[PDB]
Amino acid sequence: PQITLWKRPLVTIRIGGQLKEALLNTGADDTVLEEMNLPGKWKPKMIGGIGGFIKVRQYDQIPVEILGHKAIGTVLVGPTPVNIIGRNLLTQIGMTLNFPQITLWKRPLVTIRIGGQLKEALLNTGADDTVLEEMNLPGKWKPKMIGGIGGFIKVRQYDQIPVEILGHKAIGTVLVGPTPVNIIGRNLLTQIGMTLNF
């Protein structure tokens, strides 16, 4: 089965006996669910995203059913804006990125060429938009706020910027700001024909 990225890759999961909607997120190392009760022991942990760090409860060896596939692993619970299924569980259910095939054992980092520079960037199905580290691109831009795990950051929005990714040409909106990692979001993933497969 194949999941395209023109919309957010949302799926129903079953966890602790309950159904929930969650986002299949190649940009997350970990699985993070909104405030809920889970049985058993847990430990306090901190995780980070765009916007900064948040406190979560780490529950280990939790069973989670996703797209009819059973995973058993770490589930973090905390003030995430969206329920997220990260690579820790995507790998268990055999999910890969395809356009060539990219497994999710490691962060899916690839070289992109943009505004005449080469940079490493994260292929991120949990990102609507493409966000790059600070760079002085020419052209008109307009300010924008984008949200992630820890809150919002201010970015500059540039339109119709050519980006080559894995040898595929793309052209579209690139946001530039103080992101901790360069992110390729669905706006450009769809253009290079990337899908999620299992």
Binding site: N25, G27, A28, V82, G126, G148
Partner: peptide
């Protein structure tokens, strides 16, 4: 608003 949900521990 746009969500960009990169995450790491």
């Amino acid at each position: 608003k746009a969500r960009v949900l990169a995450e790491a521990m």
